[PDB]
């Protein structure tokens, strides 16, 4: 054997993360492997407030830059061994994956 894994999805844009979550959930259900829904970590917002001007002149204009990190956890539970049952990554640029053991 009974093996369970936790696949962690991380992306900077919502649509790429949603697509990988969708077709991985669909693939797991097609293989009749019971799967938990993608739970979402709160978005990591990297904010940097610099000054627009490259010099000291201006009207103290400050620029705000945002970077959003979206995180999802999907749990795969199979009565048999699991790594051989699912052997596809189905990824696109802009999103990364990491697979861990459910106990680990």
């Amino acid at each position: 054997a009974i093996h369970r894994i936790r696949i962690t999805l991380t992306s900077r844009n919502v649509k790429s993360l949603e697509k990988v979550c969708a077709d991985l959930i669909r693939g797991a259900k097609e293989k009749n492997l019971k799967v938990k829904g993608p739970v979402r970590m709160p978005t990591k917002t990297l904010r940097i407030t610099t000054r627009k001007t490259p010099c000291g002149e201006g009207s103290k204009t400050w620029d705000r830059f945002q970077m959003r990190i979206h995180k999802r956890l999907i749990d795969l539970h199979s009565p048999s061994e699991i790594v051989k049952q699912i052997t596809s990554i189905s990824i696109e640029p802009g999103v990364e994956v990491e697979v861990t053991i459910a106990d680990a």
Binding site: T49, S59, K60, T61, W62
Partner: protein, 72 residues
């Protein structure tokens, strides 16, 4: 929240929970005869206050106030 915000949250939580419990399990006609009392006293007892806050801007201390400027 703070002290006052917890107070207002508590009182409208009591009112909203009781009016919804009355709606769910007994007649809403008798729900209305206490619901009309609550609204005719204070609308905030059943409806949350939408106003929360305003973002701070880079020209002054607060949301709208600007810093002192001098010409001389």
């Amino acid at each position: 929240g703070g002290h006052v915000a917890q107070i207002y949250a508590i009182r409208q939580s009591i009112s909203k929970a009781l009016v919804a419990y009355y709606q769910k399990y007994v007649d809403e006609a008798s729900k209305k005869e206490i619901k009309d009392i609550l609204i005719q006293y204070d609308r905030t007892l059943l409806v949350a206050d939408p106003r929360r806050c305003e973002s701070k801007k880079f020209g002054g201390p607060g949301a709208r106030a600007r810093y002192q400027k001098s010409y001389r």
